[model samples]
Structures are given as structure tokens and as C-alpha cells.
Target: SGAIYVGNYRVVNRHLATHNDWANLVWEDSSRDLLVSSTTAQGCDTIARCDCQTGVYYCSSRRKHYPVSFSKPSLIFVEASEYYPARYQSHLMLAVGHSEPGDCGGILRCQHGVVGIVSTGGNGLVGFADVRDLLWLDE
Candidate 1:
């Protein structure tokens, strides 16, 4: 087998090592789409990094997620300016939900400044990383 490849570095892993972690890349990546919850978290209004103190479970693998609730239609989109003054800490992974235009309780999960795809599906939560461009969240 060949060594794994990420950017210019030759990572070590099986052939599917990078492929296996596609989901991981998606969530961690913040280029086009920050977070995506199509099938796994369709019912969830949104997703946030583990609050830890509250009840958020830290997920070192899949962005450490804990389902959250909102008014249903949508949630707040915090800009960089509004976020900093709030005294936020670190590059927090966050995603807001908006019911989509389909069944399966469809939702368009938006994280950071990223938007939605309208159709997303998955069996379980994942830790996705954005290697620069190309967003698999909505595709």
C-alpha cells in the first residue's frame, strides 16, 4: 500500500485512511460548510462543541458534538466581529439548523459562516477536516 497523502505530507495509513476519514474532514473543515447533520442529526436543531460544563460531550474525533435545540426555523449566525467581543475562546465548532424542503425531517445544518446543502445523510456523527477547498458536507 502507499503512504497516506494530506496536502504535501505523506501520512501513514492504509489506502482508505484518508477516505475513511472523509467525514472527519467535513466537520472540522470550515471553508464552505462548517458542520453538516443530514441523517444523523436531522432532528437536532443544531450542533455545538461540547459545553463540557453543561452537558456537551467533547468529541476529539468528530468535532466533539452535542445536539442542541432552537426555534426550529433557524438559529443565530455569529460573525467574526460579534463573536470576538463576546469573549469567545478558541476555534469553537458550531452549527445551526434550519428545516429543509424535504422529508426525513430534513435540515440544512450551517456552521460558522458556512451555509447549507438542503440534502445531507449519514449513519453517525463524524470528525471532518477541510483540506482547503471542496466541501463534502452538501455534496
Candidate 2:
């Protein structure tokens, strides 16, 4: 997809690491195209942290719109950074271990209808730092 100016970022459908990542923009557009869906996360049910019986979830990254699944969430420490707000409470991080690479900014959706955004990953895990409690940012 071609780039469009969306506020402070160049919105494209390719994957890049900085400033308004392209996969995020494409994910938003794809979610909007679904007439029955309200928003990305809202369209799906709320899968609370650590509420997995089956222990598997779906996600789309890079060229794979329907690529793979990851394990349940885990608590990780997101170090204080200039990009994220560190306030009354420290930034509580969520990660899934043994996940694929380059899936940063992808959407993490569950089979029974739940979702999150792939923030980044390392050490064989992917962190979904922006879900549930942090949905207010884009809205």
C-alpha cells in the first residue's frame, strides 16, 4: 500500500521499526473495512491476562495476514522510556515467549475472539505492551 499522511506519521502497509509503523496502519485499515467491526480490539472479546485454557492465540505479521499463533501472556518489565509514559505506576509489560521474530506491531488475536498489538519481542518472546488498559491511546 502507498503511504498517506496520518497526523505525525507516514502510513504505509510495509513493516518498519520507527514512528508510525506500517503494519499497524494496515491493521487499522483492515479492521475498519470490516463493517461489523467497531475497532480492532473492540471487534473481539476481552481475553483477560492469563486466562487461557487452550494456551494458543493467532496473529498476523509481515506478509502473513493469517500466519501463526503464540502462547499465553507473561509479565515482563518494560524499562522506563522516553516514548512511553512512566508515571504513578511503572509500565507493566505483557509478553509471550517462544514467538516468531519481526512480528512487531502486528495484531494478536485469539480464536474465541480477543486481540492485542504486537509491540516488540526479544529473547524468544513477543511483548504486547498495548492492549486492554492502554486502548485509550488511539481512541
Candidate 3:
């Protein structure tokens, strides 16, 4: 009932109201099937939920990680897939590039055997090192 987010397939936050059993659980999707009973899906896959008689659930195939049904609303996406991108990469990328910040918004990740900072839409930076003064960004 709150900010219901739908339309995108593959995974979503069904925000189910409540059901007695699997048969009555509406909005169930086959392609993205992963029923679960959790108060907060925490952005993780939560397909169906039962609030009565020792409720049961579902979730997997990317919708696999559920927190063991609790109470609240329905949703999905606790962790993420390989496509989700390393969130920490951006932080490290920005921090490292901030000094000269040449197009600060670029690629930042550990690839080809080394942690690299990249240029906005370009290749990547091939240098390194620093921290406070012990390892300064420009030592």
C-alpha cells in the first residue's frame, strides 16, 4: 500500500497483503517465482507470504537470500547479483580520484589483477598509493 513499485520484471517488491495458503497468494509470478514471508524484504526477493497458521514461504534463483519471514511489508533485493556492481568500488574510486579528480565520475574496480581508478567513460588510471601523510595521495 506504500509507494508500490512494479512494472520491472526479473525481480520486484510484491508488497503482498496476506494470504492463507499458496493457492490464494495473488500476484505470484512464475518467471520470478520465490515466495517468502518477511516483515521487510529489505530489497530482496519476497514472492508470497502467509500470515496465518505457522505461515510458509519461497525465494531463490537470484531471489534466494530471504531473512526467514518476520512481519511488516513485502519486497526484495537484500544483497544483489553480479550485475549489481561492487558498491565499495565507487567509494574507493572517488576517494582515489578526488585529489586530481580528472572527471571524478569514472570506473573504479579491481580488475586485471590490480585495483584501478578510471577516467569518465575512458580506459582507466594506471598508478597508485597513499593515506594521510603516511602514504599520501601524491607522496
Candidate 4:
């Protein structure tokens, strides 16, 4: 009997808190890949594939939720990746929010500028942060 079986991946529960007007989730893959999602409310929510290899996450998609002057910027979450060090190296990703009339929104990868990615108009973006001096370790 050679039947294919699909198993559900069970993960431990953890909490991430954000106090900004909005927040979003980001994820990384086994090959050190990165992905960013849209904005969410300020509370605990389930995030898939976001092991937090690094201490940062990326978020995308922004629009005029309210009047420019009445809207406040949002914050992002940074968690310690479970697959970090023993599994892969760490990196930083930036999440930027839109500002009022004079303030422009921009997202950038901050690790020494080796990898820089940005976007405008409220849509979220993703980029690899620098990994020049990071010491990947195993414990």
C-alpha cells in the first residue's frame, strides 16, 4: 500500500504585539527567502511561515484610510526566528507607512546598503537586509 500521506505541521503558539494604527506579517523560507503581507490590527494573530530568522519583518499595501492629516503611521513586528543560526542566517527588513501631505512613505533594507528595495504609494515591499558581519551560529 503506497499511498501518499499529508501531515499537518504543528507549531508552538507565540505572541507579537503592535501598538500602531496598523501592522502586518512577513515570512522567510528555507533558502533565506523573504515575503511581506498587508496591514492588520493591533493584537495577536496567527502568522504562517514567519519563523523570524532575523529580527525584522516587511509589510506592504497602504492606501488612504483617512484624511492624510488625520491618519497616523503604523508599526511592524520583530521576532526571533526559530530557524535562526542553527538553520540560517539573520537579516533585517524595513516596513514603512504613509505619512501626511508632506511626508512620503518609503521602505529600505538596512544592513550596509548592499541590498536596497523600496516602494511608494502605500503598497508594501520586501528586501534582504545586509549580512556582512553577522555570525551565524548553532546551539
lDDT scores of the candidates, listed in order: 0.25, 0.37, 0.21, 0.24
For candidate 1, the per-residue lDDT at 66 reads 45
Best by lDDT: 2
Q: Which ten residues in a row have the lowest lDDT in candidate 3?
A: 129-138
lDDT per residue for candidate 2 within 69-105, as digits (tens), equals 4444444444344433332212223444433544544
Candidate 4's error at 60, in angstroms? 17
Candidate order, lDDT descending: 2, 1, 4, 3
**Candidate 1 lDDT, tens digit per residue, 27-138?**
3323222332123222312232221211222232233244433222222232343212322222222223322112111222334321112221123321122112333222
Model 2 segments beyond 4 Å from truth?
1-50, 53-62, 65-75, 80-102, 130-139
Summarize candidate 3's per-residue lDDT along 35-104 as a digit string, tens digits.
2222222332122222221121111212221112122222322223333322221111112112222322
Off by over 4 Å in 1: 1-58, 61-75, 81-139
lDDT of 4 at 68: 14
Count clashing residue pairs in model 3.
18
